[PDB]
Each structure stands twice: as C-alpha cells, then as structure tokens.
C-alpha cells in the first residue's frame, strides 16, 4: 500500500523489497524480488508504482494494490542497469545500463517511438536527468562525463581526471551547481547551465572537495539546494553546505573498535522536503534516519537479512 503523503522502501541482497513508514519502524509490505539483486529503485512521479532495476531487467511493482509480483517487467539489455528514472510527467524512462548504453523508453502501449540510445566506449555508472527534463548527464567507468541534450544528437565529453571511475552525479532542483564523485573520494563541482534560454550548457569548474579517503559511493543535493550529502566506503556520510562548500555535518556508523573491520558501507542517502531529516542505507542489514543538525540517529529499520544497497524515499511537495 502507498496511500500516504510520504513513503520509503529499501532493497538489498535478501531477495526482498521492504516498504515501511517512519512511524515506528515496522514494515507494511514486503515485495518478492528474486533471481537477481536490486541496483536502484525509483518511484513514479504520479506515485502509483515503483520500479527496481537489476541485472538485465526492470521490474515495476504496484503501490495502490497489494501485489508481490512484478506486474510490468522490461527486458532487452544484456547487463546490469545502474540507475533508472522517469520524466517529471511520466512520459519516458531513462535507463543507464552497465554494458555501454544509456537509453530511453516509451511508457505508452503505442507506437510513439521517442526512444533513443547513447553509446560510449565505457561501462556506465550513473545517469542524472536535468531539472528541465531536457539534458541528461552520463558518468561512466573512465572518468568521462557526457552531458547529452535530448534536443540535439551531439554530446560533450568532459574528463576531470582519467583512469579513475566516477560513481554518481546529481543536479540540485534549483539548477545552481552540478556535482559528481569518483572512486577516490574527490568531488568536482562544475557550474551547470546558466543559459536557460537556448541550453548553452556552459561548464566551469568551481571547486574540488578533497574528502572520503576511501571510495565515494554516491552524492546527492537537497531539494532546498542548501545542502549536499555524500556517502563513502569509510562508513561515513558527510553533508556539506552550498555557500562556502565547507563541512557542515558528518555522520558515521563506526563502532570505534578494530574488531569489525569495515562491517558495512554507506551505499545511498536521500533528503526530505524540509531538508532537515535524511535517510541513509548502510550495509549493516538495516537503514537509518538522521537529522542534519543534531547529528545523532533518529530512527532505525532493521527488517533486512542481507546488505542494503539502494533505497527510495518520497514525500509530499509541502515541506
């Protein structure tokens, strides 16, 4: 069931997709996902169904009814699907695949054919739609950033540092900056398009944030565009500010004993409509809910029996 202004779900290696609500940490519905692991899941903008992508298939699960099975499944690719997402009105779904391709899909059962393919010589790691639903940033395993505009058929290629694979990228909803992280912790921040008129897509590198000695797994802005959270393989999640790009807050799941030896990474994170409470998905077979100010955890959901590598948290527009 998903009849609620706010919903959140996690997925991992235990072959289940857990749904719950931040009231007491109790699960409502556990959807059966089997024969593969979930790379990433995303909710439809109309809040009717979820879509989880893993290893050559994208499986959609109804939120209104009580169905544990993948009502709609997409096939055709040959490798993993790193990330998925839909148009702001639910018109086309952009799927970046592991092998070499970032493609679009048509969600209508008709011969519309608005689907295209973008092919690069490196495995894709992340795709990020532009806030105006026109451009799309691709980040692959060769440190190259392909800003590809759906208007034209040409894409620019930018390499901050070669021989290192970038892992994620995101653009704040207010279109103020554009950040990305790679497999060594560096976080480059180029200034995104300022020419809203005819999509000039000018890029100037503002600054680089040296942090995350270990691998950096994901970086995400805030819907208020005042914060930027990034998670690393050192069991830390650092939230930085957008004014001077300093270290605003740092959270960690380290117990402080040498007996655990990196018992779990911080795979994913997400903000709230108020930009005050964030949710993090660790590899400790559970997810946590923290506040951006008090630092300490606010809640914990521990219904999983394996690692947790992806989570979705959607809330009302008010916040």
């Amino acid at each position: 069931v998903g009849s609620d202004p706010v919903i959140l779900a996690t997925a991992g290696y235990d072959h289940t997709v857990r749904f719950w609500q931040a009231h007491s940490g109790i699960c409502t519905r556990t959807v059966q996902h089997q024969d593969s692991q979930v790379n990433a899941l995303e909710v439809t903008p109309d809040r009717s169904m979820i879509a989880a992508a893993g290893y050559q298939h994208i499986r959609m699960y109804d939120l209104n009814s009580n169905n544990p099975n993948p009502i709609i499944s997409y096939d055709g690719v040959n490798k993993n699907i790193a990330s998925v997402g839909f148009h702001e009105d639910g018109r086309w779904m952009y799927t970046g695949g592991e092998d070499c391709t970032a493609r679009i899909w048509d969600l209508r059962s008709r011969n519309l054919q608005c689907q295209r393919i973008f092919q690069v010589n490196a495995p894709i790691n992340c795709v990020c739609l532009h806030p105006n639903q026109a451009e799309l940033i691709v980040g692959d395993q060769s440190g190259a950033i392909h800003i590809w505009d759906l208007k034209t058929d040409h894409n620019e290629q930018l390499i901050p540092e070669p021989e290192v694979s970038i892992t994620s990228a995101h653009i704040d909803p207010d279109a103020s900056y554009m950040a990305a992280v790679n497999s060594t912790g560096n976080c480059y921040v180029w200034n995104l398009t300022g020419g809203i008129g005819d999509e000039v897509t000018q890029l100037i590198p503002k600054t680089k944030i040296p942090a995350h000695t270990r691998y950096a797994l994901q970086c995400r802005f805030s819907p208020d565009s005042t914060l930027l959270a990034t998670c690393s393989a050192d069991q830390t999640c650092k939230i930085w500010r957008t004014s001077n790009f300093s270290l605003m807050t740092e959270l960690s799941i380290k117990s402080g004993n040498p007996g655990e030896s990196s018992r779990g990474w911080m795979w994913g994170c997400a903000f709230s409509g108020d930009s005050q409470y964030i949710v993090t998905a660790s590899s400790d077979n559970l997810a946590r809910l923290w506040c951006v100010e008090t630092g300490e955890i606010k809640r914990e959901y521990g219904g999983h029996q394996k690692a947790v590598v992806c989570l979705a948290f959607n809330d009302s527009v008010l916040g």
Binding site: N69, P70, I71, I72, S73, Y74, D75, G76
Partner: peptide
C-alpha cells in the same frame, strides 16, 4: 497415462503462469 498428467500439470500451471506483461 503420462501425457494426460503432463497436460494437466501444464494446464494448471499456465493459468497461474500468465499474469504479467513483458516488454
């Protein structure tokens, strides 16, 4: 008859089998 048993199993399974759309 073994083919009758196989037909019964396939009949019962097929009804449960098709419930989803594959694109």
């Amino acid at each position: 008859s073994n083919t009758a048993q196989r037909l019964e199993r396939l009949r019962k399974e097929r009804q449960n089998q098709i419930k989803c759309k594959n694109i």
